[PDB]
Amino acid sequence: TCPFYKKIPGTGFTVDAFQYGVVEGCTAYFLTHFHSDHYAGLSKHFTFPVYCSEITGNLLKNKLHVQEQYIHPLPLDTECIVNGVKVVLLDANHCPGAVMILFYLPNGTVILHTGDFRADPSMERSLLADQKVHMLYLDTTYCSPEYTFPSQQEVIRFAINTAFEAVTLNPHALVVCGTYSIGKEKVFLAIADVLGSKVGMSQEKYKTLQCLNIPEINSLITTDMCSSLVHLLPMMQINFKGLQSHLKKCGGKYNQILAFRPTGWTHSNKFTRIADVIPQTKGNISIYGIPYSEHSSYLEMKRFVQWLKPQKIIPTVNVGTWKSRSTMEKYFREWKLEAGY
Ligand code: NI
């Protein structure tokens, strides 16, 4: 059945709740972003109102064929009324089109649902600064102190310098980047930019990127693989067998592959600096795992919450085990006692 942490009290609303059939008493279904664990269940047969960002509404219409009459896109940073309730959508710093949602309940309670987010100090100067938030529905993906990672900027600097060095030493090397969803476009776009190439990809993935309002996208991407020396492949193909196979397909245009797997966290982070990352190599193929995260680190999460000072926290991730739930609640209490709220 629909879990309680997907329901907004005092409303007929649900958030990221499309796989439970008709939720009893739901008058409006919000979708925070276009990732499959969140949209699971949506299709051309859905007939209730879906509220989302413009970019997520492009993806619903073009990729899932949801009929236009049930898509309700909202502008960001704008007070809007939905079924008699004031809401605002805020940038979540996750994938393209991802939002946080502020609900202003008729009784005076204010609720923030973060969706999936990467907390940032820039959020401390949005519409969030203007009033008190009483309840926080929090993306707790990496809510444990072992989760450290570098800034997105540091990671992109490493990837640009590594690619440019490799291809300038060997003009016959191919760069490959893995993907299995929207998000992390900066990885492949920044590398293609330093190399003076477009990124080549399948027709399905090009379609997906054409929904994202990225400026000058027609100048950066293409479906002509032959004209491109940065290729995008499914994340499943980023292994020695998959890459050997792909190289055969390029017809002796290339004699080396340098591949990137933008993972979330991996335990080489508790020890290793970004400066010190090395690839796995077999023959003329090298694979780099880079810690490009679109979720908060533990410290980023902790700073956001100690700034916001919510009265109650409801985790949305890692809620399926008692040991995880109990561990999170201990951190929440620590943060509250340290900060004084
Ligand atoms: Ni997500």
Curated annotation (Swiss-Prot):
It is found in: Nucleus. Induction: During mitosis. The mRNA encoding this protein contains an internal ribosome entry site (IRES) in its 5'-UTR. This 5'-UTR generally suppresses translation while specifically promoting expression during mitosis, when cap-dependent translation may be impaired. Expressed in brain, heart, kidney, liver, pancreas, placenta and skeletal muscle. May be required for DNA interstrand cross-link repair. Also required for checkpoint mediated cell cycle arrest in early prophase in response to mitotic spindle poisons. Possesses beta-lactamase activity, catalyzing the hydrolysis of penicillin G and nitrocefin. Exhibits no activity towards other beta-lactam antibiotic classes including cephalosporins (cefotaxime) and carbapenems (imipenem). Binds constitutively to TP53BP1. Binds CDC27, which is itself a component of the anaphase promoting complex (APC). Binds PIAS1. Belongs to the DNA repair metallo-beta-lactamase (DRMBL) family. This is DNA cross-link repair 1A protein. It comes from Homo sapiens.
